């Protein structure tokens, strides 16, 4: 089919550009972009130059913390009007290129945790309005009806909390609820999401994680909580606790990369 041939064409392109044997997918959300700096012998490509991909923004291959990583710095957002096929196309590419696991980070609003926290994601709730696997199943990639019981790979999660303790960074853990965006939530919406068991809320991740699961990729997800969700303070700006958290997240992801 159409999608599959794109997947293969973009995979060869990337192979030809020298994208050899990435072990890890790395999606750097809101201000972990910088960490793509520290990537060694980096192949750096603009999104606009990647066939079948286009302008969401860079894709970056090379070595980080001793591992082969395929990093997205700047990521597709559903609220920008990108379909769900295009949002998750980099995830199809990471699998088809041999990646074993995905590390997806993001910035989230805090329901059960407060600003400055880092929250390993233990599960998610998809409230985006859509599911990225709608359409014909991609048999080459996975089953029609994939099990989400273990989406945020419990082995990866244990590794993250060990690394966090051993390096003395506080690592919390909880449930992310994905919404579409791009408006922030009303306080009433935040009360319902709390009732539905969410600990944090943002505008990404869920669809990528679904496709990651379908593709058989293990997954690690971490939210930086950048602010109390609507209702828990009185306005939402200055979500720049992102900066004060920058250095802890960087060292954490690096030291996790070593151990997965
Ligand atoms: O409060 C929020 N809501 C949804 N997404 C977000 N990303 C950062 N903060 C938020």
Shape: globular
What topology, given as strand order, has the largest sheet? 5-8-7-6-9
Domain tally: 1
CATH domain topology: Rossmann fold
**SSE sequence, one letter per element:** HEEEEHEEHEHEHEH
Classified by CATH, the class is: Alpha Beta
Report, as a whole number of angstroms, the end-to-end distance.
34 Å
Structural category: alpha/beta
Q: Label the CATH architecture.
A: 3-Layer(aba) Sandwich
SS strand fraction: 25-35%
Q: Taking Cα atoms only, what radius of gyration do you get, to the nearest Å?
A: 17 Å
Bound molecules: hypoxanthine
> How many strand units?
9
Biggest beta sheet summary: 5 strands, mixed, barrel
Helix segment tally: 6
Helix % is 25-40%
What do we call the CATH homologous superfamily?
Nucleoside phosphorylase domain
PDB class: transferase
Keywords: punA, Glycosyltransferase, transferase
Assembly: monomeric
Entry title: The Crystal Structure of smu.1229 from Streptococcus mutans UA159 bound to hypoxanthine
Concise description?
It contains six helices and nine strands; from the N terminus they run H-E-E-E-E-H-E-E-H-E-H-E-H-E-H.
Q: What this model shows, in words?
A:
It is classed as transferase. Keywords: punA, Glycosyltransferase, transferase. The assembly is monomeric. The chain has helices at residues 2-17, 84-96, 154-166, 187-195, 206-214, 241-257; strands at 24-28, 40-46, 58-64, 67-73, 101-110, 118-127, 172-179, 200-202, 218-228. A five-stranded mixed β-barrel has the order 5-8-7-6-9, surrounded by four helices. It is an alpha/beta fold and 260 residues long. The chain contains six helices and nine strands, in the order αββββαββαβαβαβα. It has one domain: Nucleoside phosphorylase domain (Rossmann fold, 3-Layer(aba) Sandwich). Helices cover 30% and strands 26% of the residues. The structure holds hypoxanthine. Hypoxanthine is lined by residues 107-109, 184-185, 201-203, 226-227, 229, 236, 239.
